[PDB]
Design a protein around this nucleic acid. Structure first.
Length: 88
DNA sequence: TTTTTTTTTTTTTTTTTTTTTTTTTTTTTTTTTTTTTTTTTTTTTTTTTTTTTTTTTTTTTTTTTTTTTTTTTTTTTTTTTTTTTTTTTTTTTTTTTTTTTTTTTTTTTTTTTTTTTT
């Protein structure tokens, strides 16, 4: 479903199942600067393939907020956005 | 109209037990370090004809010390019994299949109130 709004959520609230799972899969160590090592990223293409509807757009915005606030991954160009169709 | 007996929940705070936060020891897990296998080519090793002077086997005979030999008495071998380990029937438990009965959670968004810290 929806993920935490890290802009509104405290840094201590980041310890949640969805964010912990994403941080483990990316393997950035899950901390902002204490041991943040973007060179050990496990995938150089991170693709945000959410649903093709409005709530998919909201979840995409939340994920983009997470990636930008928690930034070198976005700057290096490893983040992508998929565009699945809504109608057939 | 005054006065007398009894009953319990509270002033309770302390003893016992329970619950909840802790951190020593044997079992996992990622790292470096040492055993394996396939190519190039490379001087180098190694397979196969010819000649040759060698040095060990086969005519013949000799002996002596290992091969004959018999016998006493040991002592390894075999017998019975019992314990320890291995291995396989037996039993128990758990998991999956497909229709049924039940439930339980995490986040956005705004606005207002409690509820702690400074």
């Amino acid at each position: 479903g929806k993920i935490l709004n890290v802009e509104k959520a405290r840094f201590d609230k980041m310890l949640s199942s969805q964010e912990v799972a994403t941080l483990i899969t990316a393997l950035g160590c899950g901390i902002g600067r204490d041991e943040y090592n973007p060179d050990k990223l496990r995938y150089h293409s991170i693709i945000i393939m959410t649903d093709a509807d409005v709530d998919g757009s909201h979840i995409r915005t939340l994920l983009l907020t997470f990636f930008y606030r928690q930034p070198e991954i976005v700057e290096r160009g490893h983040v992508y956005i998929a565009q699945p169709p809504l109608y057939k």
